[PDB]
Amino acid sequence: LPIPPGDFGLPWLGETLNFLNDGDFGKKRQQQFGPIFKTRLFGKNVIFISGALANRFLFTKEQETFQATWPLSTRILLGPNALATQMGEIHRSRRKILYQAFLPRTLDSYLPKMDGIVQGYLEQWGKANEVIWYPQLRRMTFDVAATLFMGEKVSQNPQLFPWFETYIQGLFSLPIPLPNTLFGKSQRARALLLAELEKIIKARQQQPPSEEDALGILLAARDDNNQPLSLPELKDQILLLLFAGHETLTSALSSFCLLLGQHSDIRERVRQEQNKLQLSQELTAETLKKMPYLDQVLQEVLRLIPPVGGGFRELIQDCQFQGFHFPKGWLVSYQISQTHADPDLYPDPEKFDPERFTPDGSATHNPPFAHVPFGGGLRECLGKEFARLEMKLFATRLIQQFDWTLLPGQNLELVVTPSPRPKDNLRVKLH
């Protein structure tokens, strides 16, 4: 019956400029208007919800109620043929296709190359008397990603990271189409990446077909009419995998490096765990599955510092939640970082405690959708198990060979956009 409280502000524009400029935008309007507040963003009316009951609603009867929604600049720079921007039955089809790159045994098989790249970066970081971490994790993740998705020779194309960086920086920028803008820069970085992605694909097309990585899996894939994915699609899809893992996983690793830096007890607890095993050079996918305490740590890392703040959906049906009215063609924004800061769901919600996830912990006795670092439902992270594998293999190889000290004085407060990151971007020494 009734619509949520809150200011629509100006016609079309709404509170768009406040959204774009104001850090505690959602906090100010949650406090005035309570837990469910309306607003207006870029010509759409928008409801902000949060916490377990709102998540269940979003991830419930999902198909007929909610569809993905992106800003104009993002639609354009991602393109019309990416998982993120595809809809209904095409999204249903492409999600099954791409999950082939992420099966538990395709994941296992990624461990060598992945291990070599983490081992590689680990030497280089040791010999430095200081390491500025955030930008260095960025390069390492991109290297794992581009190696596992397209082959080692593709990742030693040195034009790729700089272009990709410039591509990302303008994904959520204003769509102002002059060459000297974040968006015009992204546009040109996109064209450069696409022309490179083509060469890589056409060259792989010319070889004995294999389904050992993501690019081969994509080539062998068939749509619902039994047709190969077209060439623009292959390209968008690979860019999407790159975009979707980049900031997120970099943020996750930074946060772990941060939190076990400032918590040497938990790091020794994680070290103890790996000593009770047979700590040889070799590291199996199976030995990694014998690490329940590190699993807790990574659970906790992701709840305290969630890499994806939240998300948006658009109502395709008039519907209702908590008695409030949620009208067709308005938008809904859910709030991962809010859910993860809620005091009921997490007591002392600002302390780092891996015990919350022990068999009878605080977070074990919580209702569905209380821990949502990967979202949920139809759009839940397609790369969460890949993400979990790299977080874990890294955490292991780090702790195995290194203690580490942050440096005093540095501002390690977090910038929330686009992904949480210490302001001095985490400077460090390895022991």
Instruction: Name the residues that contact ligand HEM, by CB under 6 A.
Output: 83-84, 95, 240-241, 244-245, 248-249, 252, 307-308, 311, 373-375, 379, 381-383, 386-387
Residue 122 backbone phi and psi in degrees, to 5 = -70, -40
For residues 224 and 88, give the distance between their C-alpha atoms in angstroms, rounded to a whole number: 13
We find the least distance from the C-beta atom of residue 407 to ligand HEM, in angstroms, to be 25
Instruction: Answer yes or no: is 257 a known binding residue.
Output: no
For residues 88 and 198, give the distance between their C-alpha atoms in angstroms, rounded to a whole number: 27
Q: Which is nearer to ligand HEM, 184 or 251 (CB)?
A: 251
Alpha helices in 260-383 (DSSP H): 264-275, 285-288, 292-304, 336-339
Residues in contact with 321: Cβ distance below 8 Å, sequence separation at least 6, in sequence order:
36, 49, 54, 57
We find the least distance from the C-beta atom of residue 82 to ligand HEM, in angstroms, to be 8
We find the least distance from the C-beta atom of residue 253 to ligand HEM, in angstroms, to be 8
For residues 170 and 189, give the distance between their C-alpha atoms in angstroms, rounded to a whole number: 10
Q: Which is nearer to ligand HEM, 30 or 250 (CB)?
A: 250
Q: Which is nearer to ligand HEM, 4 or 310 (CB)?
A: 310
Residue 121 near residue 110 (C-beta atoms within 8 A): no
DSSP-based three-state secondary structure for 118: helix
Q: Which is nearer to ligand HEM, 17 or 380 (CB)?
A: 380
State the CB neighbour count (10 A cutoff) for residue 239.
21
We find the least distance from the C-beta atom of residue 365 to ligand HEM, in angstroms, to be 23
In Å, the largest CA–CA distance within the chain is 66
Residue 248 near residue 419 (C-beta atoms within 8 A): yes
Q: Which is nearer to ligand HEM, 54 or 240 (CB)?
A: 240
Residue 338 near residue 48 (C-beta atoms within 8 A): no
The pair of three-digit structure tokens given for residue 164, joined into one six-digit string: 């990709």
We find the least distance from the C-beta atom of residue 192 to ligand HEM, in angstroms, to be 22
- Beta pairing class for 331-334 and 44-48: parallel
We find the least distance from the C-beta atom of residue 203 to ligand HEM, in angstroms, to be 23
Q: Which residue is nearest to ligand HEM (CB)?
A: 383
Positive or negative torsion for Cα 363, 368, 369, 375? positive
Q: Which is nearer to ligand HEM, 71 or 129 (CB)?
A: 71
We find the least distance from the C-beta atom of residue 257 to ligand HEM, in angstroms, to be 13
Q: Which is nearer to ligand HEM, 266 or 391 (CB)?
A: 391
Q: DSSP readout, 187-252?
A: HHHHHHHHHHHHHHHHHHHTS----SSHHHHHHH-B-TTS-BPPHHHHHHHHHHHHHHHHHHHHHH
Residues that constitute the known binding site: 381
Which residues fall in the annotated binding site for heme? 381
